[PDB]
Ligand binder design. Structure first.
Ligand SMILES: [Mg+2]
Ligand SMILES: [Mg+2]
Lengths: 9, 912
C-alpha cells in the first residue's frame, strides 16, 4: 500500500 | 513390493483431523493427509476407503481425494485402467448415495471430471441416464452428475483444450433432448418432493448456462411453466424459491440474442410479469429472501431485453413495464433490494448515451427522476444518527455507490433542472435534518456537472450554504462542506464569494468531525481558483505551518498542502522561494527531532513529497528554479533520515518517494545531489535490497540520461545496483520471490534504453540484463510482467526509432547483434509463456514485442516463428496443423499490431 509507482506513458 | 502407507495409519489420521484433543495434532494430521493426496498412494487408499464405508469423515476424505487426483493427476493413470476407475466410481456413488449429500457431490464431481478427460466414454450422458433413470432412488445422484458436468466443462482447474472443450459441448448438446426428457420424468415421479424439484431446477439452469438447450423446444415446455408456477405460490419455501429464481435467471441470461431466441424470449417475458402479485405477497410477509430473488429476476429481465428497451421502447419486448418492476423494487425500504439493479441502470445509461438522441432520452427521463427520487430516500440517515455519515460500513458504501450512479444518469434529466428541483424541495415543508442531509448528498453528486453559466439558481444555493449556523446537525454541516467542494467552479466564476466560502471552510477546518471534509473542499477551491487566490495565500501558509496541530487526517493534511502548493506556483518567482523554505522547514525541523528519541518520519516525508510534486512555477528567461535552493537545504536531513531507517522497507519507500518528486520538480537542475545520492543508494542497496532504489535510479536516468556528462556515472550506478540484484534473483525461485525487484529493475533498464541506448548496449552489464529479461517472461505477476515486456519492446524498437538521428546506423548495428544471438530464443520464450505460463492479460504486451521484432527484420521473424511452432508441445487434437498454419499466417501477414494480438488470443486459447 505504501509502494507507489508512476503510470505508463 | 514397496513402502506404502497403511489403511490403519490413514484412518488414525482422518480421526485425528476431526477429533484430536491437541489443536496442533489435527493440523499435523491435515498436513500429512495433504501429502497423501498429492502422492501416488492416494489412488488405492481412496478406493479402499470408499469400499469399506466406515464413516462419513473417511468417505468424504476419500471422495474429495479421488476428485482432486482425477482433476490434477489424471496422467498418473494408465489408459488401460480408465474403465475400471469409472465402474468403481459409479459403484461408490450407488453405495454412498444416502450416506451424505456432500459426499455425493464429490463423487459426482469425480465422475464428471473423469468423463471430460476420457474420450473413450462416448455418449456418457446417454449411458448414465438409461442406466439410472428407472430407479427412483438413483435419480438424486444422477441429477447431481448431470448438474456438475456442464459446470466442469469450463472449470479452470481442469485445463482441457479448447478443441476438446468444443467436442464436449457439441456432444452434450446432442444429448440435451434426453436430459430435458429426464427432467420431465423427474417431475412426474415425486414432483411434490421439494428437494426433487430443486435438483431438477439446478440441473436445468446448469444446462442453460452451458448454452446447449434448444431455445424453441424449451419455449413450449412444461418445465418452464412449472418454473413460474412455483414462483407464484406463497407456500414455496426459501430453498425452492432460490432454486427456481436461479433457473429463470439462467434461462434469461442464456438468451444472448433476442431475435434468434424469440419464442423463448416471449415465454420468459410473459412469465416474470406474472410474478408481480407474488412479489407484493413476499413484501407483505417480510420475506426478504423472496424479495431479493424477485429483484434478481426483474433485473436480469431488463438486462436480457436492454437492447429492445432502448431500440423500441414501449412496444413488444421493449415494453417499459419492465422498468416499472425495477421502480417497484426501488420502493422497498431495504436498500439491499434496489442496489441489485444498479448494474442494469449503468448499462441503460451507457446505451442511452451512445444513441445521441435527445428524443430517446426524453422517453426515459421520467423513469430516471422517479428512480432518483427513490435513491434520495434510501440515502437518508436515521433520525437519531449521532455525527457525520459513515463512509466505510455497508450503508456508507451504498451511498457512495449511489453517488457514482447519479453522476452517470444525470444527463437523462439535465443537471441544471435536477439541481434546482432538489433545492426547491428544501425551502418548503421544514424538512427534517436527515431529509435535508440526503438531498444535499444528491446535490453534491451532480454539482460538478451543472453548467456554471446559469449563475442565479447556482450562486444562490452556494450563498445559502455559507449562512448555515453551527446549530445545524453535524451530518448536514458535513455534507454541505462537500457540496461547496464540488461547487468550486461556481466560485471561480463569481470571485466575490471567495472570502465567504473560505471563511465557512475555515470554521469546519477547526472542528474535529468536519476537519477532513473541510480540508478536501479547501483543496478543490485552491486548484480551481488558483488565479485570484494570491490574497488568501498568506492565510493558507499559516495553516500550512501549524498544520500538525489541527486534528487532520494524514490524507487531509497532504491534500491541504497540495492546495497551498498550487496557489504558490502562480506567485512571483521571488515570493515562491521565500515561502517554500518556510513550509519545508516545519517538516525539516520535525525530521531533525526524530533523530534524538515512536519516531516515524512517514508523515513528514509525505508532506515534503506533496509540496515538491505540485510546486511547478512558470520559470522563463533562464531564471533559477525556486525549488532548487530548497532541495539543498532538505537533502542532508533526508539523507540522515534514510540512513537510520535503512532496514525498514516502508520508511525507505517513503524516503525515495520524496526524493522522486524532489528530482522531478527541479529536473536537470540540482545536479549537486547526483554524487551523494547515488553513493548512498549503492551503499544501502548492498546490505538491504529495497527495490525502490532501482526505481529511484530510473528517475535519475530518466532526468539525466540525455546529458553526456552523466551517462558514465549512471552506467556505474546500474552496474553497481545489478550486482546485489542478480544475487537476489539467482536464488531458488528468485523471480517468484522478488517480483518487485524484477519490476523496478526493468523500469531502470527501460529508462536507460530510451535515454541513452548506445551507453547501455555497448556495456558489459547489458548481457545479464538481456538474459534476465528473457527469463522474467515466465513470472506470473501483473506489474513485473508489464515492466519486462515494456523493456523488450523499447529495446528492439531502438533499431527503428528516430531514423533521422545521427547515431541511427550504430543503433541499427547494435540491435542487430541482439537479434542474432537472442532473437530466436526470445520468440520461443514469448510463445512459451503465452501458451503455458501467463494469463491472457499479457497478450497485448507480448504482441507489441513481436510487432517490434517484425519491424527490425520481418522475413527472419517468419523463420524464428516457424521454428518455435514446430518445437512446441502440441499436446494438452490439441493444436491442429491448420491452427498452427493460420496462426503463423495471421502474425507474419499482419498490417497492424492489433492483428498480432488477435492471433495470440485465438492460438493461446487452445491451450487453456
Ligand atoms: Mg541530432
Ligand atoms: Mg544528434
Amino acid at each position: 500500500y505504501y509502494r507507489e509507482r508512476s503510470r505508463e506513458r | 513390493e514397496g513402502a506404502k502407507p497403511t489403511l490403519q495409519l490413514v484412518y488414525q489420521a482422518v480421526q485425528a483431523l476431526y477429533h484430536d484433543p491437541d489443536p496442533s495434532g489435527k493440523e499435523r494430521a491435515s498436513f500429512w493427509l495433504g501429502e497423501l493426496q498429492r502422492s501416488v498412494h492416494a489412488w488405492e487408499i481412496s478406493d479402499q476407503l470408499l469400499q469399506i464405508r466406515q464413516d462419513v469423515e473417511s468417505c468424504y476424505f476419500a471422495a474429495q481425494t479421488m476428485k482432486m487426483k482425477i482433476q490434477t493427476s489424471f496422467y498418473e493413470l494408465p489408459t488401460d485402467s480408465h474403465a475400471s476407475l469409472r465402474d468403481s466410481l459409479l459403484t461408490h456413488i450407488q453405495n454412498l448415495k444416502d450416506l451424505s449429500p456432500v459426499i455425493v457431490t464429490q463423487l459426482a464431481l469425480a465422475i464428471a471430471d473423469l468423463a471430460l478427460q476420457m474420450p473413450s466414454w462416448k455418449g456418457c450422458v446417454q449411458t448414465l441416464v438409461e442406466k439410472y433413470s428407472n430407479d427412483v432412488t438413483s435419480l438424486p445422484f444422477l441429477l447431481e452428475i448431470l448438474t456438475v458436468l456442464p459446470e466442469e466443462v469450463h472449470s479452470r482447474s481442469l485445463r482441457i483444450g479448447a478443441n476438446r472443450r468444443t467436442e464436449i459441448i457439441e456432444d452434450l448438446a446432442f444429448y440435451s433432448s434426453t436430459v430435458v426428457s429426464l427432467l420431465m420424468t423427474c417431475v412426474e415421479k415425486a414432483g411434490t418432493d421439494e428437494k426433487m424439484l430443486m435438483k431438477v431446477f439446478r440441473c436445468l439452469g446448469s444446462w442453460f448456462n452451458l448454452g446447449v438447450l434448444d431455445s424453441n423446444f424449451m419455449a413450449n415446455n412444461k418445465l418452464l411453466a412449472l418454473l413460474f408456477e412455483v414462483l407464484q405460490q406463497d407456500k414455496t419455501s426459501s430453498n425452492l424459491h432460490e432454486a427456481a429464481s436461479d433457473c429463470v435467471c439462467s434461462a434469461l441470461y442464456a438468451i444472448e440474442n433476442v431475435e434468434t431466441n424469440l419464442p423463448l424470449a416471449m415465454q420468459l417475458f410473459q412469465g416474470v410479469l406474472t410474478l408481480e402479485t407474488a412479489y407484493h405477497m413476499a413484501v407483505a410477509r417480510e420475506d426478504l429472501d423472496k424479495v431479493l430473488n424477485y429483484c434478481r429476476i426483474f433485473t436480469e429481465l431488463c438486462e436480457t431485453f436492454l437492447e429492445k428497451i432502448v431500440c423500441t421502447p414501449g412496444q413488444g419486448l421493449g415494453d417499459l413495464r419492465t422498468l416499472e418492476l425495477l421502480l417497484i423494487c426501488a420502493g422497498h425500504p431495504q436498500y439491499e433490494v434496489v442496489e441489485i439493479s444498479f448494474n442494469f441502470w449503468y448499462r441503460l445509461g451507457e446505451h442511452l448515451y451512445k444513441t445521441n438522441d435527445e428524443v430517446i432520452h426524453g422517453i426515459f427521463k421520467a423513469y430516471i427522476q422517479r428512480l432518483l427520487h427513490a435513491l434520495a430516500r434510501h440515502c437518508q440517515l436515521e433520525p437519531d444518527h449521532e455525527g457525520v455519515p459513515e463512509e466505510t460500513d455497508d450503508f456508507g458504501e451504498f451511498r457512495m455507490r449511489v453517488s457514482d450512479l447519479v453522476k452517470d444518469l444525470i444527463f437523462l434529466i439535465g443537471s441544471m433542472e435536477c439541481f434546482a428541483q432538489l433545492y426547491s424541495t428544501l425551502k418548503e415543508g421544514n424538512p427534517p435534518w436527515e431529509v435535508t442531509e440526503a438531498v444535499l448528498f444528491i446535490m453534491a453528486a451532480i454539482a460538478k456537472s451543472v453548467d456554471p453559466e446559469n449563475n442565479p439558481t447556482l450562486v444562490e444555493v452556494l450563498e445559502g450554504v455559507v449562512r448555515l449556523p453551527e446549530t445545524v446537525h453535524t451530518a448536514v454541516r458535513y455534507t454541505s462542506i462537500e457540496l461547496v467542494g464540488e461547487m468550486s467552479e461556481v466560485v471561480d466564476r463569481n470571485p466575490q464569494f471567495l472570502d465567504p466560502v473560505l471563511g465557512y471552510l475555515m470554521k469546519g477546518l477547526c472542528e474535529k468531525p468536519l476537519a477532513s471534509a473541510a480540508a478536501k473542499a479547501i483543496h478543490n477551491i485552491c486548484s480551481v481558483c488558483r488565479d485570484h487566490m494570491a490574497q488568501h495565500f498568506n492565510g493558507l501558509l499559516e495553516i500550512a505551518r501549524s498544520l500538525d496541530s489541527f486534528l487532520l487526517s494524514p490524507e487531509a493534511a497532504v491534500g491541504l498542502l497540495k492546495g497551498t502548493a498550487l496557489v504558490l506556483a502562480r506567485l512571483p518567482l521571488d515570493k515562491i522561494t521565500e515561502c517554500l523554505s518556510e513550509l519545508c522547514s516545519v517538516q525539516v525541523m520535525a525530521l531533525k527531532k526524530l533523530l534524538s528519541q515512536s519516531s516515524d518520519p512517514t508523515v513528514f516525508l509525505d508532506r515534503l513529497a506533496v509540496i515538491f510534486r505540485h510546486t511547478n512555477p512558470i520559470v522563463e528567461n533562464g531564471q533559477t528554479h525556486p525549488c532548487q535552493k530548497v532541495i539543498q537545504e532538505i537533502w542532508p536531513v533526508l539523507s540522515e533520515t534514510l540512513n537510520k531507517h535503512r532496514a525498514d522497507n516502508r520508511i525507505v519507500e517513503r524516503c525515495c518517494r520524496c526524493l522522486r518528486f524532489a528530482v522531478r520538480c527541479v529536473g536537470k537542475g540540482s545536479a549537486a545531489l547526483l554524487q551523494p545520492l547515488v553513493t548512498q543508494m549503492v551503499n544501502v542497496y548492498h546490505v538491504h535490497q529495497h527495490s525502490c532504489f532501482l526505481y529511484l535510479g530510473s528517475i535519475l536516468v530518466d532526468e539525466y540520461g540525455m546529458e553526456e556528462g552523466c551517462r558514465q556515472g549512471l552506467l556505474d550506478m546500474l552496474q553497481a545496483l545489478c550486482i546485489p540484484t542478480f544475487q537476489l534473483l539467482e536464488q531458488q525461485n528468485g523471480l517468484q520471490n522478488h517480483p518487485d525487484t524484477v519490476d523496478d529493475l526493468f523500469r531502470l533498464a527501460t529508462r536507460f534504453i530510451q535515454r541513452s541506448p548506445v551507453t547501455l548496449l555497448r556495456s558489459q552489464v547489458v548481457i545479464p540484463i538481456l538474459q534476465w529479461a528473457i527469463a522474467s517472461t515466465t513470472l506470473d505477476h501483473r506489474d513485473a510482467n508489464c515492466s519486462v515486456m515494456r523493456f523488450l519492446r523499447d529495446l528492439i524498437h531502438t533499431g527503428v526509432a528516430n531514423d533521422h538521428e545521427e547515431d541511427f546506423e550504430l543503433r541499427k548495428e547494435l540491435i542487430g547483434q541482439v537479434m542474432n544471438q537472442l532473437g530466436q530464443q526470445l520468440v520461443s520464450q514469448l510463445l512459451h509463456t503465452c501458451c503455458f505460463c501467463l494469463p491472457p492479460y499479457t497478450l497485448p504486451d507480448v504482441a507489441e514485442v513481436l510487432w517490434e521484432i517484425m519491424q527490425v527484420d520481418r522475413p527472419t521473424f517468419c523463420r524464428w516463428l516457424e521454428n518455435s511452432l514446430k518445437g512446441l508441445p502440441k499436446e494438452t487434437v490439441t493444436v491442429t496443423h491448420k491452427q498452427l498454419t493460420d496462426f503463423h499466417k495471421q502474425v507474419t501477414s499482419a498490417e497492424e499490431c492489433k492483428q498480432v494480438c488477435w492471433a495470440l488470443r485465438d492460438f493461446t486459447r487452445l491451450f487453456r
